[PDB]
C-alpha cells in the first residue's frame, strides 16, 4: 500500500514496514515508533558503507538502506541539443522557445536556494549545530529572490505540482525539468543541475531505508549533501514548505518568508510566542533582524600583622615599624606582636 | 492728522509690549511650555521684539512727532540697536524655520540631536551676528535731524546678511515642508480612493499667511534701502514702509506663539 501523505500519516497511526527517506525516520526514533532491529554482518558487508553512515543515528542502525536517489536535470533532446549549465541562462532560453518542476514540494526547490550557499544545521566538528540555522544567509536570500523573479517573469506556474509537471513533460510541452530516479520508469537525456552565480547546486541526497543516468545521479549527489537524520527535520521542511507557499504565490516578500521559516524552525518557542513573533514580523519587516535575534536569544532560555595585649584589666587580640607605631597608639588609647603589663 | 498718527503708533507700541510681556510670562511661568527645545527660539524672538518696542519704536515715534531728532549724540547707538534687533529677529525666524524643517523631515534624529545646548548655541550665534553686523560698522564709522542715508556698500552688505539669505533659507525650508506634506496627503488620498483638496489648501494658506506677510513687511524696506543709496524717494514713504518692518515684530508672536499651547497658557494665566 502507498497512502497519500505517508510521512504525515505514519506518526499519528504508529504499517509493519515503511519505505521512505531516512530524514523522517530520525523523528520516528525520537518518540519510539521504529523497532530497533538487530542487523547482521552478512547484510552490512553486501551493502555500501556510506549508506550505513547516512542511515546511522546516535551510533545505532535503524533500518536497512535500499537505494540512493538525487535530483537531476532531465531534458528532451528533441527541444534543445545541449542543456544549460548556468541558472542565469535559463530565463533566456525559455523566452526563445515560448524549465518547470514541482513548486509545491520544497525538496525540488531547495537545491536552487542552497546553490548560492544556503545551508541549515551546519555539520561542523562531526556534529550538527541545531542553534546555527543559516537559512537567512545571503545565499538563500539570492536563491529565493531568483526563484520568485522567475515565477513573476511567466516562466513557472505558481500552482503546478509533480503531477502537472510530469503530464507536461511526457506530452513534450516543457523543455526540461528537475526529477530523480523515480521519474525514469514513467518517462531524452539527464544531466547535473545548472550552477547559480558560479557555485554548484547542492541538492539533498535521499537514501531510502526500510550507466549515464546513474552517473549523473551520483554526480548530483556528491556535489550535494546527505539530509540530516535529526528529529527537527520534520519541522524544518515544513517551515521551508510554508516559505515556498508564501514565496511562490506572492503572499509576502523574501525577507518575510525567511523570517517565518526561522520562527517555525525554533521548536522551543510556544504557540503564543510563535504567533506573537509572526505578528511582529508581519507589521514591521524593517526590524526583522532584531526580532529574529531576540527569538534566538529566548530559544536558549526555554530550552529543556596582629597585636596581643595581656594587661591586668584589658586582655585579648586585635588587628614593620609603620604597623608597630599604630599598634602602640591603639594600646595607649585603650589604657605576631605581643604586649604585656 | 499728526495726532492720529501718534495715537496709532502709541497703540501699536502698547500692543507689541503687551504681547511680548504675555509671551514671556507664559514661558517663564509654566514648565510644560519650556520643556520643548524649539520654544527656546520663540522666546528669543519675543525678547528681540520687546527690544524693538522699547529701544527702537518709541524713540522714532517721538522723533516723528516732534518733527526732528532732539536726542543729540544718540542717533548712532539708536541705529545700532535698531539693526541689531532687526537682524536678531530675522535670524530667529530663520532658525525657527530650520528647526521645524529638521523636526518634520527627520523627527527621530531631531529628538536626539536638537538638544538644549544646540538651541543655545544657535541663539548665541544669531545674537552675536546681529551685534557684529550692527555695532562694529557703526562705532567704526563704516555706515557713513538724523536723516543721513547709509552708504552703498554697507547698506548692500547689511541687507544681504540680514534679510536675503534668511529669506532664501525660509523659502527652501517651507518649500520642502510643503512638498513633504503634499506627498503624505496625496498618499492618504490615494489609499482612500482605493479603499472606497482641503488639507493642502490649509497648509498652503498657513504658509502664505506666514511668508507673504513677512515679505510684504520686510522686503520693500530693504529694496528701498538698496535703491536709495545708488540714487528718488521721499523719507515719508520710507518711514511708512519701515514701520511695517517693526509692526512685523508684533505680528510674529501672533503666528508663531498663538498655537493651542500658547492659547491654553493665556487662558489659564489671565
Amino acid at each position, epitope marked *: 500500500e502507498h497512502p497519500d501523505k505517508l510521512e504525515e500519516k505514519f506518526p499519528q497511526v504508529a504499517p509493519d514496514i515503511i519505505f521512505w527517506a531516512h530524514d523522517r525516520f530520525g523523528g520516528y526514533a525520537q518518540s519510539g515508533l521504529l523497532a530497533e532491529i538487530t542487523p547482521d554482518k552478512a547484510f552490512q558487508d553486501k551493502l555500501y558503507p556510506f549508506t550505513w553512515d547516512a542511515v546511522r543515528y546516535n551510533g545505532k542502525l535503524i533500518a536497512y538502506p535500499i537505494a540512493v536517489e538525487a535530483l537531476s536535470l532531465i531534458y528532451n533532446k528533441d527541444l534543445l541539443p545541449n542543456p544549460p549549465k548556468t541558472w542565469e541562462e535559463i530565463p533566456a532560453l525559455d523566452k526563445e522557445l515560448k524549465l518547470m518542476f514541482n513548486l509545491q514540494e520544497p525538496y525540488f526547490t531547495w537545491p536552487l536556494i542552497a546553490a548560492d550557499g544556503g545551508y541549515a544545521f551546519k555539520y561542523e566538528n562531526g556534529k550538527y549545530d541545531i542553534k546555527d540555522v543559516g537559512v537567512d544567509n545571503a545565499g538563500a536570500k539570492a536563491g529565493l529572490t531568483f526563484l520568485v523573479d522567475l515565477i513573476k517573469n511567466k516562466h513557472m506556474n505558481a500552482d503546478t505540482d509533480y503531477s502537472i509537471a510530469e503530464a507536461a513533460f511526457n506530452k513534450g510541452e516543457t523543455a526540461m525539468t528537475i526529477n530523480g530516479p523515480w521519474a525514469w520508469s514513467n518517462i531524452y537525456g539527464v544531466t547535473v543541475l545548472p550552477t547559480f552565480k558560479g557555485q554548484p547546486s547542492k541538492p539533498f541526497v535521499g537514501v531510502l531505508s526500510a550507466d549515464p543516468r546513474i552517473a549523473a545521479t551520483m554526480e548530483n549527489a556528491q556535489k550535494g549533501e546527505i539530509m540530516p537524520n535529526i528529529p527537527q527535520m520534520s519541522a524544518f521542511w515544513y517551515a521551508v514548505r510554508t516559505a515556498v507557499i508564501n514565496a511562490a504565490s506572492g503572499r509576502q516578500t523574501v525577507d518575510q518568508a525567511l523570517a517565518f521559516a526561522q520562527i517555525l524552525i525554533m521548536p522551543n518557542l510556544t504557540e503564543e510566542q510563535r504567533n506573537g513573533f509572526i505578528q511582529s514580523l508581519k507589521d514591521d519587516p524593517s526590524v526583522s533582524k532584531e526580532i529574529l535575534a*531576540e527569538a534566538k536569544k529566548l530559544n536558549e532560555h526555554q530550552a529543556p600583622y596582629k597585636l596581643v595585649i595581656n594587661g591586668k584589666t584589658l586582655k585579648g587580640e586585635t588587628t614593620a615599624e609603620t604597623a608597630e607605631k599604630a599598634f602602640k597608639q591603639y594600646a595607649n588609647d585603650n589604657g605576631t606582636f605581643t604586649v604585656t603589663e | 492728522v499728526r495726532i492720529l498718527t501718534a495715537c496709532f503708533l502709541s497703540l501699536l507700541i502698547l500692543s507689541t509690549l503687551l504681547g511680548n510681556t504675555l509671551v514671556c510670562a507664559a514661558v517663564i511661568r509654566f514648565r510644560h511650555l519650556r520643556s520643548k527645545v524649539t520654544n527656546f527660539f520663540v522666546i528669543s524672538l519675543a525678547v528681540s521684539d520687546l527690544l524693538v518696542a522699547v529701544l527702537v519704536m518709541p524713540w522714532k515715534a517721538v522723533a516723528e512727532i516732534a518733527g526732528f531728532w532732539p536726542f543729540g549724540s544718540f542717533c548712532n547707538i539708536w541705529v545700532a540697536f535698531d539693526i541689531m534687533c532687526s537682524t536678531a529677529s530675522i535670524w530667529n525666524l530663520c532658525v525657527i524655520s530650520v528647526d521645524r524643517y529638521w523636526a518634520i523631515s527627520s523627527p*527621530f534624529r531631531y529628538e536626539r540631536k536638537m538638544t538644549p545646548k544646540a538651541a543655545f548655541i544657535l541663539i548665541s550665534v544669531a545674537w552675536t551676528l546681529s551685534v557684529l553686523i550692527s555695532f562694529i560698522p557703526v562705532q567704526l564709522s563704516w555706515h557713513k535731524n538724523c536723516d543721513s542715508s547709509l552708504s552703498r556698500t554697507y547698506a548692500i552688505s547689511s541687507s544681504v546678511i540680514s534679510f536675503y539669505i534668511p529669506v532664501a533659507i525660509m523659502i527652501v525650508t517651507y518649500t520642502r515642508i510643503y512638498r513633504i506634506a503634499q506627498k503624505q496627503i496625496r498618499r492618504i488620498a490615494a489609499l482612500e480612493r482605493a479603499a472606497v483638496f482641503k488639507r493642502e489648501t490649509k497648509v498652503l494658506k498657513t504658509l502664505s499667511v506666514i511668508m507673504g506677510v513677512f515679505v510684504c513687511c520686510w522686503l520693500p524696506f530693504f529694496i528701498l534701502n538698496c535703491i536709495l543709496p545708488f540714487c528718488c524717494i521721499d523719507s515719508n514713504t520710507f518711514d511708512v514702509f519701515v514701520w511695517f518692518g517693526w509692526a512685523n515684530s508684533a505680528l510674529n508672536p501672533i503666528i508663531y506663539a498663538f498655537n493651542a499651547d500658547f492659547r491654553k497658557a493665556f487662558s489659564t494665566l489671565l
Partner: nanobody
Amino acid sequence: QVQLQESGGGLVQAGGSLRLSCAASGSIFALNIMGWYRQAPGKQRELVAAIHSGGTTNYANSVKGRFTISRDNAANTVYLQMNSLKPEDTAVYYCNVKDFGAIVADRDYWGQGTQVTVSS
C-alpha cells in the same frame, strides 16, 4: 478634539506576548507621529516606541527587537506588539500623538495610558 482610546492591557506571565491597541478619533494632520511611552510608579516616563506617518519606526535601546509598533494607514489606529515581556515591563503605557498641524509648533494628544503587569 482628538480622543485616544486604548485597550489590550492586562496581566500576563513573564515571557508571554501582548498586543496593545489605541484608536485615535478626530482630525489629525497628515504629518503626525504616533508613539508609546511607559511610566512606572516612582520612575519617570520614558519612550518605548514611535512611528511616523511616513512609515519609519523608532525603538529604544532597551526594548529594541522585543517590541514592535505599527499603524493602520487608513484608520490611524496604532498597535504595539510586545514579546518576551519581563517583570520590569510592568507600567502604565501611554499612547502619544504628536500632530504638526501648525508648522510652527506641535500638539500632543494623550489617552491616559493603560496598566500592564508582568508576573514572575
